[PDB]
Amino acid sequence: MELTAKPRTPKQKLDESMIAAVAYNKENNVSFALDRKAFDRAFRQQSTTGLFDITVEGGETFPALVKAVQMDKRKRAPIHVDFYMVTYGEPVEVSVPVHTTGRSQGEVQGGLVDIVVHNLQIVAPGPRRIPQELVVDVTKMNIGDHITAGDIKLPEGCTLAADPELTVVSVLPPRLT
Amino acid sequence: KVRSSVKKMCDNCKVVRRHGRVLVICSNVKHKQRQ
Amino acid sequence: SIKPTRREYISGIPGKGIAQFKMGNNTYPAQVENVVEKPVQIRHNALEAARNAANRFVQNSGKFRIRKFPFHVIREQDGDGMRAPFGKSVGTAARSHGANHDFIAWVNPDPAVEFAWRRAYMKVTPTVNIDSSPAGNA
Amino acid sequence: QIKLQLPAGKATPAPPVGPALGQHGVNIMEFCKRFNAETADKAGMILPVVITVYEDKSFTFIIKTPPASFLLKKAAGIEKGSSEPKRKIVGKVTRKQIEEIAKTKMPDLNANSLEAAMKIIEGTAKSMGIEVV
RNA sequence: CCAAGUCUGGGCUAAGUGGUAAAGGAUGUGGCGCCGCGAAGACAGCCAGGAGGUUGGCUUAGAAGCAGCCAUCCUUUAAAG
Numbered sequence: 001m002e003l004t005a006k007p008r009t010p011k012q013k014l015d016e017s018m019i020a021a022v023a024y025n026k027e028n029n030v031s032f033a034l035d036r037k038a039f040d041r042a043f044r045q046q047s048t049t050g051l052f053d054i055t056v057e058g059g060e061t062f063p064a065l066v067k068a069v070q071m072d073k074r075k076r077a078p079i080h081v082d083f084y085m086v087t088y089g090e091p092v093e094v095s096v097p098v099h100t101t102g103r104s105q106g107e108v109q110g111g112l113v114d115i116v117v118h119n120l121q122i123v124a125p126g127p128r129r130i131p132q133e134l135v136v137d138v139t140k141m142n143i144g145d146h147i148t149a150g151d152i153k154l155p156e157g158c159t160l161a162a163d164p165e166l167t168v169v170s171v172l173p174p175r176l177t
Numbered sequence: 178k179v180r181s182s183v184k185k186m187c188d189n190c191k192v193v194r195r196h197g198r199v200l201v202i203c204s205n206v207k208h209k210q211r212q
Numbered sequence: 213s214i215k216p217t218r219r220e221y222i223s224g225i226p227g228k229g230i231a232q233f234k235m236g237n238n239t240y241p242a243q244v245e246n247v248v249e250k251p252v253q254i255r256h257n258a259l260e261a262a263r264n265a266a267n268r269f270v271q272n273s274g275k276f277r278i279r280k281f282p283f284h285v286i287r288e289q290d291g292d293g294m295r296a297p298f299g300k301s302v303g304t305a306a307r308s309h310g311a312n313h314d315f316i317a318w319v320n321p322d323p324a325v326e327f328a329w330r331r332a333y334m335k336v337t338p339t340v341n342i343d344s345s346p347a348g349n350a
Numbered sequence: 351q352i353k354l355q356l357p358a359g360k361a362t363p364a365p366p367v368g369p370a371l372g373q374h375g376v377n378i379m380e381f382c383k384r385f386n387a388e389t390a391d392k393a394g395m396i397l398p399v400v401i402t403v404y405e406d407k408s409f410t411f412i413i414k415t416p417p418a419s420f421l422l423k424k425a426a427g428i429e430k431g432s433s434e435p436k437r438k439i440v441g442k443v444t445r446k447q448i449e450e451i452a453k454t455k456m457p458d459l460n461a462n463s464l465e466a467a468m469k470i471i472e473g474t475a476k477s478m479g480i481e482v483v
Numbered sequence: 484c485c486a487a488g489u490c491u492g493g494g495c496u497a498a499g500u501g502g503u504a505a506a507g508g509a510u511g512u513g514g515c516g517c518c519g520c521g522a523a524g525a526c527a528g529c530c531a532g533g534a535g536g537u538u539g540g541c542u543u544a545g546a547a548g549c550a551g552c553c554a555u556c557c558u559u560u561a562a563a564g
Binding site: 074076097098099100107111113114115116119169174175 | 234235236237238239240241249271272273310311312343
């Protein structure tokens with residue numbers, strides 16, 4: 001949303017209210033613009049979890065946003081970001097989240113719980129074609145059970161930029177099973 | 178009493194400033210908070 | 213930064229003796245956690261402990277995860293007196309590099325675990341930083 | 351304007367009935383002999399009484415029907431709850447049995463409707479150990 | 484005291500801090516962003532009911548919010564604790 005700059009001035013820039021952030025795209029880049037105030041808001045939404053874009057000179061109103069960056073620093077306040085769009089029908093590197101609900105099985109009865117080393121899902125469905133919020137939870141939880149890749153259950157866009165059997169999300173003893 | 182490290186008893190026990198000092202107060206002998 | 217004699221000649225190849233990592237429960241978004249800023253050969257023991265007392269006060273779901281672990285150690289009095297000092301080991305830990313990803317109170321809406329960790333900081337030693345993660349804490 | 355928890359078949363104890371009533375303007379002797387009329391049928395079980403006086407120093411009023419907790423246990427064939435609710439649920443029943451037990455409890459139940467009747471039996475069930483499946 | 488502007492400009496101190504110290508606290512004070520609203524006329528004073536199936540399970544000799552281990556739901560209605 002907006003964000004400007006692109007000359008050659010990171011220090012002061014990298015300072016005050018404007019944080020660096022390259023104009024990255026397949027084939028071309030352009031001095032860092034943006035700002036340490038927009039990043040906020042938007043970013044705050046869900047960086048590489050949905051997507052938008054800003055109007056700098058109406059130039060090229062396109063999506064893709066961030067494919068890298070960092071609030072690095074100790075303090076925990078980012079500085080020096082990466083920005084890449086995609087006006088193509090190739091959109092692959094697509095990492096969007098996946099949520100459950102709480103389906104009662106090991107929890108609200110067994111107190112047991114479940115780790116989710118997954119959460120996210122870097123895949124590649126129908127480029128510029130993804131439900132910013134995809135949910136899938138066949139339920140199940142408790143004892144020494146576990147679920148991961150393999151099973152899963154992918155809708156529409158048949159990608160899986162990932163593999164089978166691997167960090168899905170199981171149920172462990174928050175105390176004992 | 179605790180001179181050092183006072184922090185709210187009864188769901189009331191107040192926060193007062195005497196001599197910049199901060200000494201707990203609340204409807205209870207069981208709160209005579211002071212530092 | 214004086215460190216030890218080697219990873220297998222003086223004292224290197226242990227379990228360091230402690231109480232493992234993970235606790236609490238999952239959670240996809242909710243980013244609930246703790247880290248620091250202080251530098252200190254984190255007092256093993258003190259360490260191990262601490263964290264633990266953490267579980268002691270909570271119990272289940274709240275990423276009681278914790279990303280620390282000592283692995284080297286000091287030494288001192290053993291032998292003659294003060295001069296040519298050989299070495300007697302004791303007390304390993306790990307450098308808390310001037311702040312960083314401590315342990316995580318990670319979960320949907322379960323501050324009943326935030327306060328926890330909280331109780332977890334209180335403890336510890338080198339001050340500690342109370343914080344949230346990508347998004348905050350819900 | 352008093353409230354007691356007197357026993358059955360014993361209307362003469364001085365320790366509880368004496369001080370708790372005499373100082374409130376209540377003739378201990380006469381208020382006791384009247385109980386030997388209605389508590390004589392169901393003697394043995396402690397029955398709470400709610401005496402309400404006026405300005406003449408007398409009356410007895412509403413003592414008691416009985417229990418409504420043990421007869422429900424006789425049908426199901428569980429005494430007391432298993433352990434702690436929402437942690438060891440193992441006593442499932444059915445849909446049709448919960449539907450007919452609420453149709454008679456209506457006098458002291460919330461509203462005279464059919465949708466509100468099934469909702470109270472859902473709250474007092476999960477607070478104990480009777481899950482509806 | 485001892486030579487040299489009780490210079491001018493605009494902030495911040497109400498403790499003599501300055502004139503040694505840490506963990507640790509607290510509507511101190513001054514400057515920055517958030518959630519709810521004041522004509523569904525808003526937080527703190529004041530009038531009132533201060534709702535019913537809630538008086539569920541371990542322990543009951545007593546949980547029946549106001550011993551503590553598990554619940555955390557339904558409601559006829561001015562809403563719900």
